[PDB]
Design a protein around this ligand. Structure first.
Ligand SMILES: CCCCCCCCCCCCCCCCCC(=O)OC[C@H](COP(=O)([O-])OCC(O)COP(=O)([O-])OC[C@@H](COC(=O)CCCCCCCCCCCCCCCCC)OC(=O)CCCCCCCCCCCCCCCCC)OC(=O)CCCCCCCCCCCCCCCCC
Ligand SMILES: CCCCCCCCCCCCCCCCCC(=O)OC[C@H](COP(=O)([O-])OCC(O)COP(=O)([O-])OC[C@@H](COC(=O)CCCCCCCCCCCCCCCCC)OC(=O)CCCCCCCCCCCCCCCCC)OC(=O)CCCCCCCCCCCCCCCCC
Ligand SMILES: CCCCCCCCCCCCCCCCCC(=O)OC[C@H](COP(=O)([O-])OCC(O)COP(=O)([O-])OC[C@@H](COC(=O)CCCCCCCCCCCCCCCCC)OC(=O)CCCCCCCCCCCCCCCCC)OC(=O)CCCCCCCCCCCCCCCCC
Ligand SMILES: CCCCCCCCCCCCCCCCCC(=O)OC[C@H](COP(=O)([O-])OCC[N+](C)(C)C)OC(=O)CCCCCCCCCCCCCCCCC
Ligand SMILES: CCCCCCCCCCCCCCCCCC(=O)OC[C@H](COP(=O)(O)OCCN)OC(=O)CCCCCCCCCCCCCCCCC
Ligand SMILES: CCCCCCCCCCCCCCCCCC(=O)OC[C@H](COP(=O)(O)OCCN)OC(=O)CCCCCCCCCCCCCCCCC
Ligand SMILES: CCCCCCCCCCCCCCCCCC(=O)OC[C@H](COP(=O)(O)OCCN)OC(=O)CCCCCCCCCCCCCCCCC
Ligand SMILES: CCCCCCCCCCCCCCCCCC(=O)OC[C@H](COP(=O)(O)OCCN)OC(=O)CCCCCCCCCCCCCCCCC
Ligand SMILES: CCCCCCCCCCCCCCCCCC(=O)OC[C@H](COP(=O)(O)OCCN)OC(=O)CCCCCCCCCCCCCCCCC
Lengths: 52, 53, 120, 140, 459, 48, 63, 99, 345, 19
């Protein structure tokens, strides 16, 4: 986000459904749940250029 | 009452003494090389602490 | 371009590391110019509302000067913090990658042969 | 068409003058149909017959400018046997400007086209010799 | 230098806080004190350049220009305080503010140690002279003259900014002394040629070069007297100063790239002196004389000889003083007869004897009478140009002949001859304008007596 | 009474004047205070 | 004050401009290298957050 | 026609004030502004400033370089050394490329 | 217009862009833009004149088409990557859809044909709110995706934006259309500097806003609708001609005005990324922008256009329209250039 | 002697919405 009120106050208005392994109703995992789980935790903390 | 009438005559002399003041601060700032220039290496006389001010 | 740095607090004005910086001396050309800008703002306000330029609204001119120096001081603290962390990250990258920044051996004017171009 | 416009630069200047004239005529025709489409869309004609006539006139004019520009550039380069020289492209730019002035029927536009298109083609030559980047990727 | 800048800054509160019956007196007296204060920059007892601070410095070339600007500022006030008598007090104070701001910004411009600050101050001086010309000009054409002047200068100056940013990215700091010490030879490639042309074209425009000089005659014709002073005596010399500063990083390709501009300067001074022979406007004639003299300055700066640089510096100062004096005389006649026609007023030798003496001495300075600094600059420019190429003497001699021709034609048709007896409204003389005449002529005498002050960087 | 209508600025707005003076003095005290503890934090963190 | 004041002030000015120039050059090279391969603090382009991934057991085992 | 004021005629300023000096309309400001430009322009600048720059010593080391040249001519002529060497720099301190 | 609808519409106008900046989701940025559009339509049709109806209709159809191209790009990304973010490997076709839609959101050329039309026929306050507030949320989305954009089409859009804006500003006489073409040129500058550093993009946006607000305010004081109307400002309000001249010179980018600083630092980083031809063309078109600014100054301040009889009662009456915010924004838009290192991050 | 200022025709050259 361009402004980070969301990160500053700790509230999550829309950050909990960005992607497939996010909050799912009644624990029904989306398709390719583990596969993009691996993609996020590979890319976390290394930046966009290193992620590619 | 004359100091009210002719108070504008001191502004330009105030700028002159202020201009000379800030120029003195410039000499204090740009003094990384007091007595370190290789052309002016002389040992300091016993009555002085700096070569120039 | 520095918003993605590690340890960056989101939407933070002056973090605690900024408190390690020297504050502005409060009588410097930047804050003096900001106060003069506030005085000019008050004078302009008086002329536009068609009052005496400096004989009217002395409290307004005072508030303009105080607000301008306040904003200038805190903005100046933030900018010195930003430039400090810019130079800090630059030097940290320099020491982190020394093979990408080799110390060149600049050679004197006894073996460098610069061309001579006569003006005749 | 990217491979085509790259194949323009495959050979040094003064060689395959016919190929250079053909490719620059094609590029001028593309620029002409773009400009004519913009003209007929922004300013609509009273009928489709004169609309497509205006498209044809603009396309023919731009194609003629590109054709004689590339032709004169190549022939000047091979007559002076000096391939990488911007003055050849300046001569081509004035040839394009004189074609523009002839199609517009005004010597003032002819002279302005000479000076402006000669400068543009000369700076294009300097860019393609000394590695100028028109739309660079961000590096810093 | 900062002790020069600050009291000139406080001149503006003095202007806006003085009484309406004392503003002219206070500002003129304190600007005379500014000139006296700025005279201290000639204390150069050693070869090293007076680096006052990290952003201000003085040089043997920058010092006479600063002293000249500080000297013309009270002259600008004295000449302008007659056509502003039928004027509002706020507008009078605003005009004085424009003159003081021009003086301040030009002093910082000449004392600059950084080319990008030189550019910022370049447009900072570009603004208020436009304001002066457009607001206080007399005829309809002042708006067209302001447009011509402004946009010639801007279209010149943008490629200068482009080249400055590129060379700053190339070397690192763009400071004058760092450039002068770590100067690198260019590879004489096409990109370097375009870089040279970009960084030269601004100063060549504002000199002005021949062919691009069309803004100058209309600017001086439509301008008031103070605007004519500031242009013809400071801003052309500002363009020359810019070339002398920036030419040090342009070796060696300036050797061949100087060719079209030397030719343009020589033929331009020939044709502009011809215009001075055939011109029906006094202000236009003085303006075209300024174009010819600045063409000499261009030729010297382009050939890059120590004699050429020294003669360029002395011609800078001499032409600034004598052009301001000639414009002052023309403006005095203009407030007399309310007309700028060259031929209309003829027999002023009778009615104005001492003003005719000032006319004669001004034109004698104009045609480079010995041993004046006008002749010193013109002759040393001839010396360096003849060293550069022997056939420059023909064009130089034709220019000198036509220069003497138009100066004596000015004197003969404006002072000598039968008096136009229908001109009833010929006021005898003002002590104000006569004092202005003497304050223009006496520094010429003093600089003739001691020409070592204005030699410049080289010699 | 000179004017035929009462001006809106005939009498000074005393609440506005008091708020202006109070805000100015409060910001001056706050500014000098933050300058002092910034100086003290500087010296206590760098040992000066 | 004499020539030595101007001489040593000029030396200080030239020094300060020299470190300013060489620091600007290294700043340009650092920015170029970081844009080429972002591995320092600057130019770290965003990435979706890891902490919004469920690790609890779900309805289907094949996840 | 549009309601414009007529052209103002410039009157003879010497008619009301025969001792006019060019500076301002009323005689009191006229004579004092005259006295300012003479005392601050001619008196303290054209005389004191002329005297100040007349007594600047060793302007760009001109008098020093004459005295040092006379010293060096004295030093070289009594020892057989040439007045001027052809090379400013000693060639032993310059290492030329091998080819 | 009652206070209830005034509060609802103004709060939605505020809430749209704030949602767009604060929100991570492409969906929520799209709905923030949607909020801004629906909130600002009634204030364009507030005056209920046929010109206002035309402006509202043109603005609505243009903004709706741009919103749906944005939505196409968002849904195509969500199909391709399964997320709600242009992260790193989203398709260049999708990104070009986003860029075209956001450019026609903004009103820069060749999508600029509606902006003078929309800003004409509406009151000056809503032209100000449009040309300042409505161009932050598309800039928020564009700044969010700066490294992924295609620099070629970015630079081409920018340079044609500045060319068309400069030519339109030279041609037009109406003050609202002059402001629209000035807007188009400034968005060309921001769009060009966008891929290299969004910090200078935001700096130029703030400088443009703080220059455009007080000039619009000076237009509000007398509803000076035309060059003649701003020309008799010497008889209407003579104490502001100096600030009018200074604000228009700062909009032209003459040094030492602080409006020279965004153009100067943008050109500086353009040379840092080696696009000298681009920067030179942009700077000469900025000179042309300065030309029509200088002609406006010639009309309004340096010359004194003939006045009419009823301006005597205009001088008889008194006005308190110039608010407390005008002078501060004018001074920060005029004399801020020595604070350039503090303005630049 | 008076400074020229715009008249009716110079003031009317700016009206017409096209210039
Ligand atoms: C009466 C008015 C003054 C009252 C002062 C009262 C307070 C006081 O005593 O302050 C002492 C205070 C003590 O200073 P210091 O801590 O000893 O350091 C002074 C040194 O010289 C160190 O200072 P420095 O020389 O290093 O300057 C710091 C630096 C940073 O400072 C600044 O940037 C401020 C520049 C202010 C001018 O300055 C610059 O970088 C100079 C930039 C110059 C180019 C700017 C180009 C833009 C156009 C011109 C300026 C804009 C004017 C308005 C628009 C019109 C344009 C024509 O002195 C000052 O603040 C000096 C400036 C005072 C005058 C300000 C301008 C008027
Ligand atoms: C670069 C990337 C790679 C290539 C990409 C593809 C190609 C791109 C080409 C770009 C340049 C051409 C653009 C033309 C636009 C329309 C011009 C026109 O005719 O308007 C008339 C039209 C009004 O027509 P009208 O009312 O019937 O007026 C009757 C005429 O007065 C009746 O006048 P007339 O009877 O005298 O008719 C003679 C006619 C004959 O001329 C034509 O029909 C057009 C010929 C244009 C030739 C110029 C380029 C030549 C290149 C040669 C290259 C050779 C090889 C390379 C080496 C040398 C390089 C220099 O002349 C004209 O129509 C001249 C119009 C003004 C042209 C100004 C061009 C300035 C830039 C020139 C250099 C580029 O005006 C408009 O439509 C105005 C609005 C324009 C909106 C579009 C703005 C963007 C334009 C650029 C788009 C670039 C591509 C897309 C980028 C992404 C954005 C979506
Ligand atoms: C000083 C210079 C700056 C002054 C700014 C204020 C100007 C103003 O209000 O003037 C009105 C007022 C005079 O008005 P008035 O005659 O009494 O009555 C008003 C009339 O009735 C009003 O009559 P009206 O409204 O019926 O008609 C008049 C109207 C008619 O309209 C016109 O005639 C239109 C004219 C259009 C053409 C001119 C356009 C403007 C050109 C500006 C400069 C541009 C070029 C310069 C270079 C680039 C600059 C970016 O306007 C005018 O004639 C001109 C009005 C404005 C003139 C003053 C402009 C000042 C700013 C620009 C110059 C200074 C900065 C640049 C230069 C910097 C140095 C190089 O002037 C002042 O009061 C000046 C200030 C004097 C006291 C200064 C005290 C300083 C104290 C410092 C220590 C305390 C604070 C410490 C703070 C820090 C604490 C830590
Ligand atoms: C007042 C005169 C106006 C017209 C003449 C202006 C100056 C003419 C010479 C300069 C070219 C134009 C300005 C660009 C300045 C570039 C300076 C520079 O950095 O050069 C090196 C650079 C080269 O970059 P480089 O030096 O980094 O090269 C790197 C080289 N290698 C890779 C080998 C290490 O040159 C350019 O980038 C030039 C691009 C110019 C593009 C724009 C041209 C437009 C047309 C010119 C005139 C336009 C206005 C007049 C129109 C008609 C009016 C009647
Ligand atoms: C009245 C002003 C009140 C300001 C209150 C504090 C605002 C704040 O927290 O600002 C922080 C903001 C964002 O900081 P950061 O996390 O670096 O985000 C990068 C986005 N530029 O920082 C910024 O946006 C930096 C630029 C601030 C400019 C302020 C003036 C315009
Ligand atoms: C060599 C100089 C070539 C100049 C070409 C040019 O632009 O000419 C412009 C001119 C305009 O046409 P016009 O003036 O109407 O006269 C045509 C009558 N044959 O058009 C012509 O003269 C066109 C002549 C035919 C084409 C010649 C190529
Ligand atoms: C990248 C490439 C960009 C190219 C951009 C330019 C394209 C070619 C020129 C297009 C000109 C269009 C306008 C035109 O025709 O101008 C000619 C002008 C008026 O001539 P006229 O007979 O009135 O023509 C009817 C109007 N079209 O005629 C004149 O004004 C006569 C001028 C005669 C002298 C010209 C000398 C050179 C001037 C520029 C020097 C630059 C250095
Ligand atoms: C970067 C720039 C940062 C600073 C920007 C803001 C500068 C100050 C603006 C506020 C100001 O000047 O307020 C003055 C005003 C004085 O009130 P007054 O003059 O009486 O006007 C009210 C009419 N009845 O004061 C007020 O109306 C309220 C005073 C403060 C109350 C808390
Ligand atoms: C620096 C940049 C200046 C830019 C313009 C400035 C304008 C404002 C000026 C304000 C006042 C500053 C005056 C500056 C020059 C002062 C002249 C001066 O006194 O020079 C010093 C000189 C003695 O110096 P010295 O070193 O002995 O001479 C060389 C010997 N090696 O002293 C002398 O020789 C004595 C001088 C005074 C005595 C009277 C001289 C009368 C000369 C009569 C000449 C007659 C012929 C004139 C022909 C003119 C033709 C046009």
């Amino acid at each position: 986000p361009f402004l980070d009120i969301q990160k500053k106050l700790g509230i999550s208005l829309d950050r909990h459904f960005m992607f497939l392994s996010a909050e799912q109703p009644y624990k029904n995992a989306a398709r390719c749940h583990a596969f993009e789980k691996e993609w996020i935790e590979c890319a976390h903390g290394i930046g966009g250029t290193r992620a590619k | 009452q004359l100091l009210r009438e002719h108070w504008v005559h001191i502004l330009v002399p105030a700028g002159f003494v202020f201009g000379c003041y800030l120029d003195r601060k410039d000499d204090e700032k740009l003094t990384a090389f007091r007595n370190k220039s290789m052309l002016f290496q002389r040992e300091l006389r016993p009555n002085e602490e700096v070569t120039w001010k | 371009m520095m918003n993605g740095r590690p340890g960056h607090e989101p939407l933070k004005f002056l973090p605690d590391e900024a408190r390690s910086l020297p504050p502005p001396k409060l009588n410097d050309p930047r804050l003096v110019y900001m106060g003069l800008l506030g005085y000019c703002t008050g004078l302009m306000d008086n002329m536009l509302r068609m009052r005496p330029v400096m004989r009217a609204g002395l409290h307004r001119q005072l508030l303009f000067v105080t607000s301008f120096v306040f904003a200038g001081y805190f903005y100046l603290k933030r900018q010195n913090y930003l430039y400090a962390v810019k130079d800090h990250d630059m030097f940290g990258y320099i020491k982190l990658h020394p093979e990408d920044f080799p110390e060149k051996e600049k050679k004197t004017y006894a073996e460098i042969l610069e061309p001579f171009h006569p003006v005749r | 068409v990217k491979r085509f416009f790259e194949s323009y630069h495959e050979v040094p200047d003064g060689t395959q003058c016919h190929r250079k004239t053909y490719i620059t005529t094609a590029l001028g025709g593309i620029c002409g149909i773009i400009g004519s489409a913009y003209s007929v869309s922004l300013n609509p004609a009273d009928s489709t017959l004169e609309a497509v006539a205006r498209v044809g006139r603009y396309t023919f004019t731009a194609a003629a400018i590109g054709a004689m520009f590339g032709l004169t550039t190549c022939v000047s380069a091979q007559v002076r046997e000096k391939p990488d020289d911007p003055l050849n492209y300046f001569i081509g730019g004035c040839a394009g400007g004189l074609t523009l002035g002839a199609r517009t029927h005004s010597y003032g536009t002819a002279a302005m086209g000479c000076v402006y298109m000669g400068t543009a083609a000369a700076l294009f030559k300097i860019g393609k010799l000394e590695g100028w980047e028109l739309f660079p990727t961000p590096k810093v | 230098m900062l002790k020069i800048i600050l009291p000139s800054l406080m001149l503006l509160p003095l202007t806006w806080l003085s009484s309406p019956k004392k503003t002219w007196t206070n500002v003129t007296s304190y600007s005379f004190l500014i000139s006296l204060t700025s005279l201290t920059l000639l204390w150069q007892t050693d070869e090293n350049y007076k680096n006052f601070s990290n952003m201000f410095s003085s040089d043997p070339l920058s010092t006479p220009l600063i002293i000249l600007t500080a000297w013309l500022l009270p002259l600008m006030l004295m000449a302008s305080q007659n056509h502003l008598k039928k004027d509002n007090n706020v507008l009078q104070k605003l005009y004085i503010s424009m003159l003081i701001s021009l003086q301040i910004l030009l002093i910082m411009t000449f004392s600059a140690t950084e080319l990008i600050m030189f550019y910022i101050l370049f447009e900072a001086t570009l603004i208020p002279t436009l304001i002066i010309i457009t607001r206080w000009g007399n005829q309809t054409e002042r708006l067209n003259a302001g447009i011509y002047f402004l946009f010639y200068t801007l279209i010149g100056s943008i490629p200068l900014l482009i080249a400055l940013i590129l060379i700053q990215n190339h070397v690192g700091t763009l400071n004058l002394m760092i450039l002068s010490f770590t100067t690198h030879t260019l590879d004489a490639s096409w990109s370097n040629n375009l870089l040279w042309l970009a960084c030269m074209m601004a100063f060549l425009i504002k000199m002005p070069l021949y062919g691009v000089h069309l803004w100058l005659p209309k600017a001086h014709v439509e301008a008031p007297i103070a605007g004519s002073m500031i242009l013809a005596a400071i801003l052309l010399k500002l363009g020359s100063y810019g070339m002398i500063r920036i030419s040090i990083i342009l070796d060696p390709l300036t050797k061949y790239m100087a060719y079209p501009f030397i030719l343009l300067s020589l033929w331009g001074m020939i044709m502009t002196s011809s215009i001075c022979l055939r011109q029906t406007d006094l202000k236009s004639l003085i303006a075209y004389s300024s174009v010819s003299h600045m063409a000499l300055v261009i030729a010297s700066i382009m050939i890059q000889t120590p004699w050429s640089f020294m003669g360029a510096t002395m011609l800078m100062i001499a032409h600034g003083l004598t052009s301001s004096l000639l414009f002052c005389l023309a403006n005095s006649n203009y407030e007399r007869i309310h007309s700028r026609t060259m031929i209309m007023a003829r027999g002023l030798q009778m009615v104005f004897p001492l003003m005719a003496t000032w006319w004669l001495m001004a034109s004698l300075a104009n045609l480079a009478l010995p041993p004046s600094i006008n002749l010193m600059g013109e002759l040393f420019i001839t010396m360096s140009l003849f060293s550069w190429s022997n056939f420059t003497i023909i064009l130089m001699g034709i220019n000198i002949i036509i220069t003497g021709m138009y100066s004596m034609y000015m004197i003969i048709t404006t002072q000598r001859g039968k008096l136009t007896n229908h001109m009833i409204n010929l006021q005898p003389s003002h002590t104000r304008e006569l004092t202005l005449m003497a304050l223009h002529m006496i520094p010429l005498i003093l600089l003739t007596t001691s020409p070592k002050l204005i030699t410049g960087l080289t010699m | 009474k000179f004017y035929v209508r009462e001006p809106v600025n005939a009498k000074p707005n005393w609440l506005a004047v008091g708020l202006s003076v109070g805000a100015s003095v409060f910001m001056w005290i706050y500014l000098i205070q933050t300058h002092n503890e910034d100086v003290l934090e500087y010296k206590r963190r760098n040992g000066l | 004050d004499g020539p030595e004041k101007n001489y040593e002030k000029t030396l200080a000015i030239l020094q300060i401009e020299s470190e300013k120039a060489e620091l600007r050059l290294k700043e340009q090279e650092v920015r170029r290298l970081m844009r080429a391969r972002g591995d320092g603090p600057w130019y770290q382009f965003p990435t979706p957050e890891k902490e919004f991934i469920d690790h609890s057991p779900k309805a289907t085992p094949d996840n | 026609q549009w309601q414009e004021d007529p052209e103002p005629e410039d009157e003879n300023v010497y008619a009301k004030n025969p001792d006019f000096h060019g500076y301002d309309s009323d005689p009191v400001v006229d004579v004092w502004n005259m006295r300012a430009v003479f005392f601050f322009g001619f008196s303290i600048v054209l005389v004191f400033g002329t005297t100040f720059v007349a007594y600047v010593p060793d302007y760009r080391m001109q008098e020093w370089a004459r005295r040092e040249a006379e010293r060096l001519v004295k030093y070289r002529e009594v020892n057989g050394l040439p007045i001027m060497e052809s090379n400013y720099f000693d060639p032993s301190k310059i290492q030329l490329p091998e080819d | 217009m009652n206070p209830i609808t005034l509060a609802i519409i103004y709060f939605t106008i505020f809430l749209g862009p704030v949602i767009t900046m604060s929100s991570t989701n492409l969906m929520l940025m799209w709905v923030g833009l949607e909020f801004s559009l629906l909130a600002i339509i009634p204030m364009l049709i507030n005056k209920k004149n046929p010109r206002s109806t035309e402006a509202a209709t043109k603005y609505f159809v243009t903004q709706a088409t741009a919103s749906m191209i944005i939505l196409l790009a968002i849904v195509l990304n969500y199909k391709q990557l399964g997320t709600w973010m242009f992260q790193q490997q989203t398709n260049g076709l999708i990104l070009n859809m986003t860029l075209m839609a956001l450019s026609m959101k903004l009103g820069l050329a060749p999508f600029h044909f509606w902006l003078p039309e929309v800003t004409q026929g509406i009151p000056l306050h809503m032209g100000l709110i449009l040309l300042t507030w409505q161009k932050i949320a598309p800039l928020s989305i564009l700044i969010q995706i700066y490294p992924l954009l295609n620099s070629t089409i970015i630079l081409m859009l920018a340079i044609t934006s500045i060319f068309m804006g400069a030519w339109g500003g030279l041609n037009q006489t109406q003050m609202r259309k002059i402001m629209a073409y000035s807007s188009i040129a400034h968005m060309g500058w921001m769009l060009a500097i966008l891929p290299y550093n969004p910090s200078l993009t935001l700096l130029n946006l703030m400088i443009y806003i703080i220059l455009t607000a007080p000039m619009f305010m000076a237009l509000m004081l007398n509803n000076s609708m035309t060059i003649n109307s701003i020309s008799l400002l010497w008889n209407k309000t003579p104490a502001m001609l100096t600030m009018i001249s200074l604000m228009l010179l700062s909009l032209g980018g003459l040094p030492p005005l602080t409006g020279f600083l965004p153009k100067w630092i943008i050109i500086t980083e353009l040379m840092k990324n080696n696009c000298l031809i681009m920067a030179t063309l942009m700077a000469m078109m900025a000179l042309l922008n300065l030309f029509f600014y200088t002609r406006l100054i010639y009309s309004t301040s340096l010359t004194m256009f003939p006045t009419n009889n009823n301006s005597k009662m205009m001088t008889h009456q008194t006005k308190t329209k110039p608010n407390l915010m005008f002078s501060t924004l004018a001074i920060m838009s005029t004399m801020t250039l020595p604070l350039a290192p503090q303005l630049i991050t | 002697a008076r400074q020229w200022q715009p008249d009716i025709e110079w003031a009317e050259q700016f009206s017409g919405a096209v210039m």
